[model samples]
Target: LHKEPATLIKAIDGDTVKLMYKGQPMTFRLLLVDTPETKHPKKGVEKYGPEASAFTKKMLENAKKIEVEFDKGQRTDKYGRGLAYVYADGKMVNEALVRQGLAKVAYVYKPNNTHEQHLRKSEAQAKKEKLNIWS
Candidate 1:
């Protein structure tokens, strides 16, 4: 129900992104999916990380409109970044990442587990097709 208006700033990686939400800069960690890492302080890039990041960035940047919605869950995580679902022109970016095997359904806990059904099915499809991370 949030559907708060947002604008793209940049993608931190596949699952994390920076944005302008309701006129203020906000960084969101897309709920329920964790993609491989393109850059880490010390861990470095992992397999499929670059591709995942590229896909996410492209989707967000190309969108005509963007929005975000938080669960009745965490407003922010340990790092204090916003925890929410990102929609690029009405499409859930989190689900897209999983559908393409760029991310895995994870970090699920508490009331934050909303929208699990669709995400699981998407991941299952990706797994069945052995796409990217599934490969």
Candidate 2:
């Protein structure tokens, strides 16, 4: 898929992160998941928010390499932040969070569903086991 290499600047939340790509710092949200919030203007803090974010932080920091992949549909949100799947140390972090029950498959749109089946499998297992958010 020609994933682009990036350097993480911060783990903004479980599903969002900031990174330097092509010499420019940018933000990207996990393409197929919506996680709880650690901070927000209207939603405020949410359940298991810190735990999810903590997991992302540790995962990214420990990774020797990071990269991102864009979907075939819209590549960004209304705020102009990039929408891409995240990989850390050769693992898909988006699937990791879903499998761990830290996030749920969401924000899906047409033409960008190439990985939907792959991620939903993880979510199914996570839900069947009642892990974290799935509980």
Candidate 3:
């Protein structure tokens, strides 16, 4: 896991962010969770579409340094980029998204993910209490 230059450009969803590194723009799908899509072509926007995007923007705006944590399986998809858990400013952005109930627990190839547990709990709590974004 090496450090890299990360400049956030846009928000694809709560758990997905687009970044520019060394002049190359890449999309990093935050591991361990999925968020409601605000820009999906097929599926329409969800409840907190705007809020999720805004929150991601606020967290990643002007970010320069970033860390990428490798997973247990594949390093990346067919895109030739590494799939990892992102950390910025001492915060696990992937987990944070879930903790806030902005994302849903997901695993592409892995199973029984601990992070997913957290996401599920957070989502359940959000649903139960009708959190800000969930409403």
Candidate 4:
């Protein structure tokens, strides 16, 4: 895993974020986790999407420090957005989202499977508890 210090700029949605990475602005799509759609020009907003977005914003914004960890897999998605797992105050934000029931396991890509098992486990617990989005 390659790590870079970052400052959270904004939460675009639940799974997407903008950050100041190495003094450069960049957008990253959270790896291995998918939150609901808070924004879609055509689709408007999906159920639980706003809640997920708010949860993510509060978590990232309230963190004492933030970092982006790039997996050993492909660095960017087809849209050129960076693919990463975010860390906030020493905690994996991606995993936390899953554990908190704000997001779900979305193992769409092949390369960034580093945290797949852990995230799946978290999702399972969340599902078992029927929390938030899982409800």
Q: Give lDDT tens digits, candidate 1, residues 1-135.
A: 578888888899998899987788888999999999988868689999999999999999999999899998668999979999999899999999999999999967888888988999999999999999888
The TM-score measured for candidate 3 stands at 0.72
Using lDDT as the measure, the top candidate is 1
Tens-digit lDDT track of model 2 for 1-135 = 569899989999988899998999898888888889888978788998998999998999999999899988888889879989889998999999899999989967988888999999999999999999879
Instruction: Sort by TM-score, best first.
Output: 1, 2, 4, 3
Superposed Cα RMSD, model 2: 1.1
The Cα error of candidate 4 at residue 110, in Å, is 2.2
Model 3 residue pairs with clashes:
none
TM-score of 1: 0.95
Model 4 residue runs over 4 Å out of place are: none
> How many clashes show up in model 1?
0
User: Model 4: per-residue lDDT, tens digit, 1-135?
Assistant: 767789988899989999998898899999988888867778688888898888788889999999899987798899989999999888998998899898888856777798899899999999999998888
| Global lDDT scores for all candidate models | 0.91, 0.90, 0.67, 0.88
> Rank by lDDT, descending?
1, 2, 4, 3
3 or 4, greater by lDDT: 4
Off by over 4 Å in 3: 1-5, 20-24, 62-64, 78-82, 111-114, 124-129, 133-135
In candidate 4, the residue pairs with backbone N, CA or C atoms under 3 Å apart (3 or more residues apart, or in different chains) clash, namely none
